[PDB]
Design a protein around this ligand. Structure first.
Ligand SMILES: CCCCCCCCCCCCCCCCCC(=O)OC[C@H](COP(=O)([O-])OCC(O)COP(=O)([O-])OC[C@@H](COC(=O)CCCCCCCCCCCCCCCCC)OC(=O)CCCCCCCCCCCCCCCCC)OC(=O)CCCCCCCCCCCCCCCCC
Ligand SMILES: CCCCCCCCCCCCCCCCCC(=O)OC[C@H](COP(=O)([O-])OCC[N+](C)(C)C)OC(=O)CCCCCCCCCCCCCCCCC
Ligand SMILES: CCCCCCCCCCCCCCCCCC(=O)OC[C@H](COP(=O)(O)OCCN)OC(=O)CCCCCCCCCCCCCCCCC
Ligand SMILES: CCCCCCCCCCCCCCCCCC(=O)OC[C@H](COP(=O)(O)OCCN)OC(=O)CCCCCCCCCCCCCCCCC
Ligand code: SF4
Ligand code: SF4
Ligand code: SF4
Lengths: 155, 387, 69, 115, 176, 318, 97, 80
């Protein structure tokens, strides 16, 4: 029986792949500062293995923080669009998660769903660094149950 | 032919906001730079026209998010000025206190992120720890972390929780030691200095025509301040002294920001010594809501509550321009009020919107690798510039 | 504070293994003692002389004074 | 031959590791291919290029200064002979000559790097 | 007053320029000063383990939007529409049909936590303190659907913790 | 038996790279007043395996290369050089004892730049080209200077053997006879690697490592590999050249221990320098080398050609 | 001379806290291994620990244990595992448990 | 001279010190007393087997038995 090997290896590539998950910080607006406080020493990211590094090609997952204007949106989807095929999007802040304090006028896009698909919505304005961190952890716990390979085994 | 057209980059790891940029250059030298601003523009001023004064205030919080209680102070001073009100003294003092605290924030950010952009991974960390202590103050004060208003027209509401000024004192005690630790971290570093010495200088009159107001005019000649010349509140009384520099060299501007942090410590101290125990909000029931004890059990307090929330206080018509000293330089809102509840047309003034327009001349003489430092040196937030 | 020093210890084992490796492997594969160093032709000549006079074809066993007897 | 075995190995492990690194990502669980890649228009990064003489000249002076460096390289063998006078004379002479080249190029408009 | 920096006379006199050739040349200030003030390393870093430890907060902190009710719960909300009227994001909805008893409550009371900026205004405006910003920040829903709250979800949020909120309000009502 | 030697040499330098990256993240962490990774495994010892197998498994990701040759050449070259550089380094015993030696390391270190020319060449992105040309420029300019230093500090050995270096070190570390040239050669070792201050970067900058560090995925775990391994090397070759311990035969692991400790501490100083100081702008760097280092190297050199004949001690070529 | 006190701190905490296997348990559970501090009013499966006040910010800490809501298992630790009142007193909201 | 050197040593210490190391490195090998020692050392190390010559019918010196002193003596190196 090889399905034991299947599930174990799943927990291997999954275990590691989630344990690191170092993203890129898109950081449009005042949610970006709070994110940096998640990178500050007190709430520090590194303990959890998340690394701070900037490039869409190295990017494991993406954090959309700040308000997404019409003018920025296409560039955003390009940054999404050159990325390692396994990828995840975490929407930070009331703005990007469905329009926040604006949701109106014109230039602002309403939600980041209308641009790219999204996984973890973390509300707050800004979401307290603890809350954002809880969002990343919950993303990890979405990575646990991926069970991606044994359905490639088609059983 | 030669030249080029290069473009921006999406983020440095600490990036606050994104610009594009188009620089027509020569071989590793920039002849023409033309920043494209307006990338992040959320259309606040159109929104404010649709929402009453008490409602539109968080816009004046988060248009410039880094420095916050300052912008609060700007809009509040505008509505008070136009509305013929004075806040009670204790309100003015608290407002000054958190004003200079906020200035300590925006300065420590500007400096540290200016380091992280250039190199120097660590000072960002050392100091933003203390910044986290600062937000630890806000969370007690206003009941939230960053954008929480805690400022109104006719004075602040919800005075300090019992035991706050002790913590304020305790931070203010050794902040001096820590900022001096930064001054050994830099300032005689051959690297940081020798990277920024003569880059992006400015002539005083030139800065006046380009309208720079802030650490720009400070560090380059032309001694000027709004704090000293046009005191807008009890911030007049307390003693302190502003720095200047004679080299106009962008290094002077740095050191001026530093010394403004230190002086901010002086102002915080004296403020902690002078605090009168008067009251929070003004006593006029129709400008600002009553506290709940009076709200209940008393009729007129209830009415003024209910209407003052639904409709909101009416402001007589007039055109005002108020200007304060915000850590990015002179900040102001131009209010236009139809006699009404809502405002009508209010255009904020972003110091970054001026300073940014100066990169054309300032960056004319240095190659792009230091155009980095040219942008980062003048405190700027592309959330404030656009609006 | 101590977080880094175990990692540094592991770097110490990790850079310290090839030294003891190569040294012990000389002191084993090459006989009881070190491998000769042939840099100059003379020393090589002496090596292959030891080789020929070993009868083992190896310069490990050096014979000895009594081999003439 | 021994070091040549070391080169055969060290070239293998390079090759092997490279191969593993190509297999596994396109041996991965699901590989999906859509997005267009525009080589397209000239201003994406930079634009065109008017390649500038400075860098090339740095390559050049890297040559001449190499040549003088390797011409100087055998000295540790030569520092011991029965003629010391001549030795000092032409070693100090030679690298002094290197420094003469450098001093000349440092006097003319060369280098100076802001242009 | 003006107190200005960098306007100074660098001494080209001897014993200053000694330490200037020493300074440029030998990197003493760089080495000693910086390398040592980083060798300041040993101070116990400030980091907190978030699952197992949590940072400080305040009784006035603003969490998520729990509705409250009286002892012997009446649905403390009167429907009076204020919290909706002062919402600076406009995100609230109230429709109130007088119920069986003749007292008035809300049929649909909704919030978009997306749109919500977490002011605190709806916490000030409620005459009876029906809605209060919770202490708990508990979030990270997997769908844009899940961030929209019915009157029902807000109730169940209120039932999940009250004596919490009762402790906060009972603490700070003297300030408001 | 011999392939056992090879494997015992090259596998531990790879493991050394992984756990090195760990120590990097930690030292920078606490240096920055914050704990490094604790939550991958205990204390952070599972972090490399994470980085390893994940960073291998993320899919190849872009673009049309335009050269199938170079793209799969450059990584193989960068590794192969980084692995064979370790051969002569003395240890108690070299594993290949070469008469010339140190200039062989110098030579391959000179070859190491084709991975940058070709790597940055096959991008098909005309910006990564320019970036690569520039990085080649600074690496090459510090291949000038360094060579002259070895050609000086060696002149107290008397031969290139790289073994006799450990014989010279017996009485006094070579740091004392020339400290300054050792200082210049330390900073020179910072040069090629482009550790801070000398690194290029993200945000706005030349972004050579933008596409260089981005592109080629797993093969970026390779360039990653050769860069860090090469670092550990230059630290070790410093530890051998400018200092060292006493070799007590019959117990070589003693010298191996002491050697190891000093080398590791030196690399620690690399990672914390990178924490410490900002970066130079590019031209100020290149002509900082041309301004000052190279002239003073010439002076110290000729002073080491003329010195040993003064004091009448000129070294004993064997 | 002084270091013996240090190794007595570590030796003490590992000895008294958890026993032989307990150090590995709590260690992989939470990479923070702290001296046993008081008791902390267990209530549900999750156990609480309030430090002697030695230092702020990391004042107090918790282990979530297992089985909450007859659902999930250990290794799933996150927020919201704390009940409301322990959410209050664990966040510095109030100094009274 | 004095002002010139003070100013070039105020501005560019690396270059002044470089010329100092240079010049002193030029002159000092001429003056120092130890020079000849190095030469006599370097000549005292044979790389090549000393090859005998027909003794009889010669002027006596550099005698047969290696102990017989008449030849050159590096004893000055034996104690130095
Ligand atoms: C794993 C468990 C870790 C743990 O829980 O530790 C807490 C526990 C005590 O924590 P604590 O109650 O907070 O008391 C320590 C102070 O808070 C804080 O301790 P401290 O930092 O005040 O004491 C420092 C002390 C403690 O250092 C050591 O114990 C390490 C050296 C001796 C190892 C034996 O250092 C020394 O005795 C040597 C100082 C050397 C200075 C120069 C260093 C240069 C190289 C830097 C790299 O740590 C120990 O008892 C240390 C045991 C591990 C030592 C290293 C063993 C492997 C080598
Ligand atoms: C700068 C790094 C120095 C490191 C330490 C080395 C110290 C000595 C360095 C050289 C002295 C530099 C003085 C500054 C002016 C140099 C001008 C120069 O060399 O021009 C080329 C000079 C030109 O001399 P010129 O007569 O045409 O006048 C100078 C004209 N300019 C400066 C415009 C070029 O050419 C020569 O000197 C002819 C070839 C000389 C060959 C080598 C002789 C060596 C000595 C033998 C005894
Ligand atoms: C008695 C007989 C004769 C005896 C003669 C003896 C004479 C001795 C005289 C002194 C000898 C030389 C001393 C060292 C010189 C090294 C080169 C140097 O001086 O560099 C300085 C240079 C100055 O920079 P700048 O001012 O920009 O340039 C001037 C250009 N007009 O550049 C700089 O300052 C910037 C360089 C910064 C490098 C990055 C930071 C490095 C930090 C760590 C450095 C220390 C490492 C120590 C080694 C570690 C272990 C090996
Ligand atoms: C399309 C590209 C295809 C090729 C890709 C290649 C990728 C890797 C390229 C980089 C690696 C280059 C390696 C060069 C090795 C040089 C070895 C050398 O010079 O060793 C010196 C040593 C001297 O010995 P010594 O100490 O004097 O004496 C011993 C005791 N008497 O010497 C000895 O002990 C004798 C050793 C002789 C062994 C034969 C050497 C053959 C070298 C063939 C090189 C082929 C590759 C060329 C480089 C390509 C670069 C792109
Ligand atoms: S959600 Fe709030 S804090 Fe975040 S970007 Fe929008 S306004 Fe700023
Ligand atoms: S806190 Fe939210 S619901 Fe309340 S008034 Fe503000 S945006 Fe509206
Ligand atoms: S203000 Fe209070 S009582 Fe009035 S409708 Fe809103 S929640 Fe209900």
């Amino acid at each position: 029986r090889g399905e034991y090997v299947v599930a174990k290896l799943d927990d291997l590539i999954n275990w590691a792949r989630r344990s690191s998950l170092w993203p890129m910080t898109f950081g449009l607006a005042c949610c970006a500062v709070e994110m940096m406080h998640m990178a500050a020493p007190r709430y520090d990211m590194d303990r959890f293995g998340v690394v701070f590094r900037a490039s869409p090609r190295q990017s494991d997952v993406m954090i959309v923080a700040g308000t997404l204007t019409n003018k920025m949106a296409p560039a955003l989807r390009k940054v999404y669009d050159q990325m390692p095929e396994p990828r995840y999007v975490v929407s930070m802040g009331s703005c990007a998660n469905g329009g926040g304090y604006y949701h109106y006028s014109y230039s602002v896009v309403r939600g980041c769903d209308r641009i790219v698909p999204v996984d973890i919505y973390v509300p707050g304005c800004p979401p307290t660094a603890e809350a954002l961190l809880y969002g990343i952890l919950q993303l990890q716990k979405k990575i646990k149950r991926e069970k991606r390979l044994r359905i490639w085994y088609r059983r | 032919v030669s030249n080029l057209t290069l473009n921006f980059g999406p983020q440095h790891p600490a990036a606050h906001g994104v610009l594009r940029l188009v620089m027509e250059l020569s071989g590793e030298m920039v002849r023409k730079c033309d920043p494209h601003i307006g990338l992040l523009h959320r259309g606040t001023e159109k929104l404010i026209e649709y929402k009453t004064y008490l409602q539109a205030l968080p816009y004046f919080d988060r248009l410039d998010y880094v420095s916050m209680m300052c912008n609060e102070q700007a809009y509040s001073l505008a509505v008070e000025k136009l509305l013929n009100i004075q806040p009670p003294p204790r309100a003015q003092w608290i407002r000054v206190l958190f004003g200079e605290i906020t200035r300590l924030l925006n300065h420590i950010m500007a400096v540290t992120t200016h380091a992280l952009d250039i190199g120097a991974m660590t000072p960002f960390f050392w100091m933003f720890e203390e910044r986290e202590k600062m937000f630890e103050f806000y969370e007690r004060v206003s009941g939230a972390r960053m954008h929480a208003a805690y400022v109104r027209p006719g004075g602040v509401h919800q005075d300090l929780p019992l035991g706050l000024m002790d913590d304020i004192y305790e931070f203010s005690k050794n902040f001096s030691l820590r900022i001096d630790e930064l001054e050994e971290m830099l300032t005689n570093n051959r690297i940081w200095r020798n990277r920024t010495v003569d880059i992006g200088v400015v002539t005083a009159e030139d800065a006046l025509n380009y309208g720079f107001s802030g650490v720009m005019l400070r560090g380059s000649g032309i001694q000027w301040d709004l704090r000293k010349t046009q005191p807008y509140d009890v911030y007049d009384q307390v003693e302190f002294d502003v720095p200047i520099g004679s080299r106009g060299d962008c290094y002077d501007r740095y050191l001026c920001r530093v010394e403004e942090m230190r002086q901010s410590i002086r102002i915080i101290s004296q403020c902690l010594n002078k605090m009168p125990p008067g009251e929070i909000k003004v006593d006029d029931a129709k400008v600002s809501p009553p506290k709940r004890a009076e709200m209940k059990t008393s009729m007129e307090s209830l009415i003024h509550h209910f209407k003052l929330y639904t409709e909101g206080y009416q402001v007589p018509p007039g055109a005002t321009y108020t200007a304060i000293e915000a850590p990015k330089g002179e900040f102001g809102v131009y209010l236009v009020s139809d006699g009404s509840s809502r405002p009508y047309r209010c255009k904020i003034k972003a110091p970054g919107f001026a300073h940014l327009a100066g990169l054309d001349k300032m960056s004319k003489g240095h190659m792009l690798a230091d155009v980095v430092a040219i942008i980062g040196t003048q405190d700027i937030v592309f959330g404030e510039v656009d609006r | 504070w101590f977080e880094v020093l175990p990692g540094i210890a592991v770097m110490g084992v990790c850079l310290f293994i090839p030294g003891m490796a190569t040294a012990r492997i000389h002191r084993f594969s090459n006989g009881g003692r070190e491998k000769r160093v042939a840099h100059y032709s003379y020393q090589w000549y002496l090596m292959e002389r030891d080789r020929r006079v070993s009868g083992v074809n190896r310069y490990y066993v050096s014979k000895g004074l009594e081999n003439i007897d | 031959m021994n070091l040549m075995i070391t080169l055969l190995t060290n070239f293998t492990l390079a090759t092997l590791l490279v191969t593993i690194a190509f297999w596994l990502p396109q041996l991965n669980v699901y590989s999906e291919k859509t997005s267009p890649y525009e080589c397209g228009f000239d201003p994406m990064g930079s634009a065109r290029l008017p390649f500038s003489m400075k860098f090339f000249l740095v390559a050049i002076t890297f040559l001449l200064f190499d040549l003088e460096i390797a011409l100087l390289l055998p000295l540790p063998w030569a520092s011991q002979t029965t003629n010391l006078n001549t030795m000092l004379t032409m070693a100090l002479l030679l690298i002094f000559l290197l420094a003469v080249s450098l001093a000349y190029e440092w006097t003319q408009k060369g280098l100076e790097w802001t242009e | 007053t003006y107190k200005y920096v960098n306007l100074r006379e660098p001494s080209m006199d001897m014993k200053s320029v000694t330490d200037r050739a020493a300074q440029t040349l030998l990197w003493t200030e760089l080495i000693r000063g910086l390398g040592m003030t980083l060798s300041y390393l040993f101070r116990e870093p400030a980091t907190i383990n978030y699952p197992f430890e949590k940072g400080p907060l305040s009784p006035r902190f603003r969490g998520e939007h729990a509705l409250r009710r009286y002892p012997s719960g009446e649905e403390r909300c009167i429907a009076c529409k204020l919290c909706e009227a002062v919402c600076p994001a406009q995100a609230i909805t109230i429709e109130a049909e007088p119920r069986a008893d003749g007292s008035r409550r809300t049929t649909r009371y909704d919030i978009d936590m997306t749109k919500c900026i977490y002011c605190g205004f709806c916490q000030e405006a409620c005459p009876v303190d029906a809605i209060v910003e919770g202490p708990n920040f508990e979030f990270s829903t997997e769908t844009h659907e899940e961030l929209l709250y019915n009157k029902e979800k807000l109730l169940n949020n209120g039932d999940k913790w009250e004596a919490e909120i009762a402790a906060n309000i009972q603490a700070d009502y003297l300030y408001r | 038996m011999f392939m056992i030697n090879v494997l015992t040499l090259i596998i531990p330098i790879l493991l050394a790279v992984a756990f090195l990256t760990l120590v990097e993240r930690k030292v920078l962490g606490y240096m920055q007043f914050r704990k490094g990774p604790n939550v991958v495994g205990p204390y952070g010892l599972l972090q490399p395996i994470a980085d390893a197998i994940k960073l291998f498994i993320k899919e190849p990701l872009r673009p049309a290369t335009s050269s199938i040759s170079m793209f799969i050449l450059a990584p193989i070259l960068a590794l192969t050089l980084a692995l064979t550089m370790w051969i002569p380094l003395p240890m108690p015993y070299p594993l290949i004892n070469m008469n010339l030696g140190v200039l062989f390391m110098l030579a391959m270190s000179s070859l190491a730049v084709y991975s940058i020319l070709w790597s940055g060449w096959a991008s098909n992105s005309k910006y990564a080209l320019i970036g690569a040309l520039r990085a080649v420029a600074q690496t090459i300019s510090y291949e000038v200077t360094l060579a002259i230093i070895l050609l000086s500090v060696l002149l107290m050995n008397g031969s290139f053997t790289l073994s006799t270096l450990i014989i010279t070190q017996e009485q006094v570390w070579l740091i004392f006879p020339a400290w300054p040239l050792a200082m210049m050669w330390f900073i020179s070792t910072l040069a090629e690697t482009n550790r801070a201050p000398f690194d290029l970067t993200e945000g706005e900058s030349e972004l050579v490592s933008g596409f260089n560090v981005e592109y080629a995925a797993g093969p970026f775990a390779l360039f990653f590999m050769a860069e860090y391994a090469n670092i550990i090397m230059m630290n070790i070759f410093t530890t051998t050249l400018f200092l060292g311990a006493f070799h007590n035969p019959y117990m070589p692991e003693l010298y191996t221990i002491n050697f190891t400790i000093k080398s590791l501490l030196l690399s620690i100083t690399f990672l914390w320098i990178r924490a410490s100081y900002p970066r130079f702008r590019y031209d100020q760097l290149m002509h900082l080398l041309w301004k000052n280092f190279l002239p003073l190297t010439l002076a110290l050199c000729m002073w080491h050609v003329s010195l040993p004949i003064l004091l009448s001690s000129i070294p004993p070529q064997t | 001379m002084e270091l013996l006190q240090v190794l007595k701190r570590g030796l003490q905490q590992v000895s008294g806290h958890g026993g032989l296997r307990g150090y590995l348990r709590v260690l992989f559970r939470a990479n923070d291994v702290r001296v046993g501090t008081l008791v902390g009013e267990d209530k549900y499966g999750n156990k609480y620990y309030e430090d002697n006040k030695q230092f702020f910010g990391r004042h107090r800490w918790v282990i979530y244990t297992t089985e909450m809501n007859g659902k999930n298992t250990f290794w799933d630790v996150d927020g919201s595992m704390v009940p409301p009142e322990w959410h209050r007193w664990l966040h510095c909201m109030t100094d009274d448990p | 001279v004095a002002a010139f050197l003070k100013n070039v040593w105020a501005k560019e210490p690396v270059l002044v010190a470089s010329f100092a190391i240079a010049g002193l490195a030029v002159i000092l090998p001429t003056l120092s007393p130890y020079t000849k020692y190095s030469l006599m050392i370097n000549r005292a190390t044979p790389y090549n087997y000393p090859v005998p010559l027909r003794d009889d019918g010669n002027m006596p010196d550099v005698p047969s038995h290696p102990q017989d002193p008449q030849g050159p003596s590096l004893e000055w190196l034996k104690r130095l």
